Structure 1
């Protein structure tokens, strides 16, 4: 509009405005205290209200990137707390905003969020409800600087709903802790899922993201025509382009417009949207993003009639390559909800390479006649992977499957730091607990598309301080071949065994007071250090060392030896 901050304030309302601005500052300035961010948000909100009253007021005609960029450099502790980040304010937009994105720390070096007792949180929630929810938006945004901002507003609504219901219950802990544990897990998954959308945009461009969007939406909305799916992909690409670039006010506004358009044209998109569209606005967008795949229309013609057996295959492809390739991806994705997105991208990439060399010959039809037969090896390749990994997971359980994959990937890339290897390998085991129960119909889009997210975690956490060129090679190769690049890696022989440090294998009584999950990570951290020292150690001897450590921990926690049990286990 005329005043951009007034257009977003009037579309989103003050509540969502204040919350999104808070996320914005917390994602860029991740080290500043909570009190300093509230003043900026309130100063932005007071300034925004003056523009709603008069759009032609002072400073109201500036762009959102300019207004947000200027207020960022007003903090006196910018260069003393963030270092060289202040040097980037000497640039105009958008050259200034692009640097601020580079300084977002994916591992921001922040203490773990200790959760107070249930009676303490409930008293604080009743004292100041607005401040209590602001600290939740603040603490999550810092540790997740790319978190899907409109989706974070929804998590805050459920976080508020969990306390409103449970703090009046007779047994508050039995009510609240299950909801909080589920909210944290679903929030970590949402963070990692969105971190791949931004990496795909910031490292491979919109074309690679629109192809991903076309595939998944065609599996999800098979009844919709191509022009309808393309319209949704165009609107969805602009949303995540803004969210990943920090334009959180435009992202949540455009997402609400997109959610509203789908519901007013559901009969042209999908039949699974009747219930999702009867929810409040913030819940409406979340429901649509997780709706089931609609039933594809019955009696569909084969792709060979329009893409292999036609006198205008090369004619329509030459007239518009990406449009013709986008129709092939759409027609194939809608018919195959059992394929993963990344697989459909490989089949489209293969179909593209064939049309580039065959359409230049004199007999194109005889050249690309058997193009679909080249897809058989690509389809069976991830099925052998999932089948072998799920059989290994069903015979060990999640924890032993995590350790099995923890030793496997430590031997592949031993240079990666231990905290990064532990988190990634633990998440590589959670995909087994989530997908290996589905039948072979819905198992591939579950497993392989979640491996895309987890391996992206390895890429971003290694992108900061690279220590291994093997991860860099698989991360910057072609995005869609990331998993095959890692699944084909062998044990790194050029890695020299690390030095021996006894302080790493020394513990205290603090390990007994930790939770069972925190104890597993404490032990798995010691397992990664064991594999680095002896890369050629057999898996059975690695079990003999882990069986002694798993027994030594239980021995010292039961026996009240005043942690002298841990000190005596020195050698």
Structure 2
């Protein structure tokens, strides 16, 4: 194509082109006001239209990196607001784009988005385009690795919620539960895509493919290995591009891949029919989220090919990545009841069994028992999920979250209290989600969502590193992460954090807060208690936290709340230390 920007504009259309370019700028420049971005978008777009009319015009030849980075580097008050990015603007491409990518704030600490139904419905009716763009801007800067097409799709859900509810009698009751549901989806989708980008960053393209082979084989058991391989090759390209802010290319290739999948849907899965009769944005999303197809009646026995064949060693040497990819494909497609990382551990164990056995004097006799080496790998996560769901059903979300905050603070007492609380709470929502699913779907749900939660912890740990053990578990192996974390215990020689009475003192300001924020305040204190008394048993900690709870509930119900906290607080702070020895 003579002009790549003209080509993307022609392919994607103005609405989505502008949308994606807005997302892209918002993610790189997280602090800038909405009006600054709208003009960068409007200027780039006008250029695209000029180029679409004449591809031979001056500068239309330039790459997208060149044109997008030049526009970023023109922003007012760059050196003041984005010091790191100004440095990047000295560089030529592709070094410039590589600099930009190195500098992206995952946790910018911007204010929490609260829906205001009257004000927003008013802004929606006066100017929908401005209102919908605002939502794209706010989510993009809050989540810098969110995939453009995914966000544009969710921007339309957000529009449909406002279209439906704003004319109605009760605006809040129609809208609040819908927007809360959309937020739930934004969070998970953001976490899934962040895990893909982190996999590229920490482990590379090979590991993302292996993850994709495993996951798509489970989703599409009817598809043959060539079809899975095809989709994985293309999907990995889409993901690398989106992760890298190349949102025009990502959007365009994503749409071509959905086209191919739907063209070949009879061969890939019977569950795609629902996805393939929709518009382009809706279709990519449905495919990405499609439920698993039923198992084929003609799945082949694996023993003959992967355990019994006497030429395996030659097979392993002469065609390594194709023999392993095929194994992973076969094992994964017949195990929708396994998690992705467990499948990856199984594949790693298969590979390692071959290296060991094929150096030995009599290989067939060694690798004959290779499938029996997988048994302990399956049982370990099955026990964890049964055990955690048992606790969750007994004690409920709040107490389950408290148990995990204790567990994880004991593993990583150097990690910040906000982070420890955030992870413990996220891991507790895993119980809510997964333990109520059908029993055969618990293990995949649990482990896969655990993996998302642990990857969040790792992304934070890249920014603020406090623990060598966390560094190893985050950076040694993608497959081994969750079991590396589960194996962590309290350091023998971690020095307890010095006691601060003010950390465990509560006040009347808590009483007015919503339930979740009250919980966060008490769960924060729980974490601190562990940090001061790391050797305290979880049962001591449960009791002590319960006294703080009974104390907060009492003084918040008092006639004089400040007097109650002032009187009853210090004694509980003193006695609590003695109960945790």
TM superposition score normalised by structure 2: 0.95
Give me the whole-angstrom Cα distance separating, in 2, the residues matched to 1:34 and 1:525: 34
Is the CA contact 2:221–2:296 (under 8 Å) kept in the aligned structure 1?
yes
Whether 1:326 aligns to 2:325 is yes
Aligned-CA RMSD value: 1.6
Distance 1:538 1:346, change over 3 A: closer
Q: Which residue of 2 aligns with 1:160?
A: 159
Residues 451-486 of structure 1, C-alpha deviations (whole Å, 9 max, x = no match): 111100000011101011111111011111111111
- Counterpart residue number, 2:295: 296
1:423-443 deviation per Cα after TM superposition (whole angstroms, max 9, x unaligned) = 111111111111122344222
Partner of 2:8: 8
Counting matched residue pairs gives 570
Q: Does 1:33 align with 2:14?
A: no
* Structure 2: distance between partners of 1:421 and 1:436: 22
Q: Distance in 2 between matches of 1:315 and 1:38?
A: 60
In structure 2, the partner of 1:384 is 383
Moved more, 96-105 or 541-550: 541-550
Q: Give runs of aligned pairs for residues 1-400 of structure 1, distance below 5 A.
A: 1-116=1-116, 118-361=117-360, 363-400=362-399
- The 5 A counterparts of 1:450-465 are 450-465=449-464
Does the residue aligned with 1:44 lie in a helix, a strand or coil? helix
User: Cα 1:214–1:264, aligned 2, differ >3 Å: closer, same or farther?
Assistant: same
- Contact 2:417/2:527, CA 8 A, preserved across alignment: yes
Q: In 2 relative to 1, CA 435–123 (structure 1 residues): closer, same or farther, beyond 3 Å?
A: same
1:415-564 alignment runs, 5 A limit: 415-561=414-560, 563-564=562-563
Q: Distance in 2 between matches of 1:560 and 1:22?
A: 52
d(CA) in 1 for partners of 2:35 and 2:99? 25
- Measured after TM superposition, the shift of residue 161 of structure 1 is 0.2
Measured in 2, the distance between the counterparts of 1:5 and 1:295 equals 42
Paired with 1:381 and 1:259, the residues of 2 have a C-alpha distance of 37
Task: Report how far residue 410 of structure 1 moved.
Answer: 0.6
2:403 corresponding residue in structure 1 = 404
* Residue 575 of structure 2: aligned partner: none
TM-score by length of 1: 0.96
Deviation readout 1:243-295 (Å, 9 max, x if unpaired): 11110111111111111111111011001111111122211111111211111
| Alpha-carbon shift at residue 102 of structure 1 (Å) | 2.1
Residue 196 of structure 1 deviates from its aligned partner by 0.4
SS at match of 1:62: coil
Asked whether the equivalents of residues 422 and 525 of structure 1 are also in contact (C-alpha less than 8 Å), the reply is yes
8 Å CA contact 1:398–1:429 kept in 2: the answer is: yes
Could you tell me how far apart the structure 2 residues matched to 1:7 and 1:323 are? 36
Alpha-carbon distance, 1:105 to partner: 1.0
Q: Secondary structure at the match of 2:266?
A: helix
User: Is contact 1:6-1:49 (8 Å) kept?
Assistant: yes
- Cα deviation, 1:203-246, whole Å, max 9, x if unaligned, reads 10111010010011111111111001100001100000001111
Deviation, 1:567, is: 4.4
- Aligned residues of 2:506 and 2:569 also touching (Cα < 8 A): no
Measured after TM superposition, the shift of residue 562 of structure 1 is 6.2
Deviation at 1:315, TM superposition (A): 3.0
Give the drift of 1:163. 0.3
Residue range with higher mean Cα deviation, 150-159 or 387-396: 387-396
Farther-moved stretch of structure 1 (457-466 vs 493-502)? 493-502
Q: CA deviation at 1:361?
A: 4.5
Residue 509 of structure 1 deviates from its aligned partner by: 4.0
Report the Cα distance in structure 1 between the residues aligned to 2:363 and 2:311, rounded to whole angstroms: 10
Which 10-residue stretch deviates more, 176-185 or 551-560? 551-560
Q: Indicate how the Cα distance of structure 1 residues 558 and 148 shifts in structure 2: closer, same or farther if over 3 A, else same.
A: same
SS in 2 for 1:301: coil
Deviation at 1:511, TM superposition (A): 2.4
Bigger mean CA offset, 99-108 vs 402-411: 99-108
Unmatched runs of 5 consecutive residues or more in structure 1: none
Preserved CA contact (<8 Å) 2:108 2:142: yes
The CA distance in 1 between the partners of 2:315 and 2:384, in whole Å, is 37
Residue 479 of structure 1: SS of its match in structure 2? coil
Deviation at 1:569, TM superposition (A): 5.0
- Name which of structure 1's ranges 148-157 and 506-515 shifts more when overlaid on structure 2: 506-515
| Bigger mean CA deviation after superposition, 161-170 or 33-42 | 33-42
Contact map agreement 1:414 1:492 (CA 8 A) in 2: no
Paired residues of 2:79 and 2:86 also in contact (CA < 8 A): yes
Gaps of 5+ in 2: 571-581
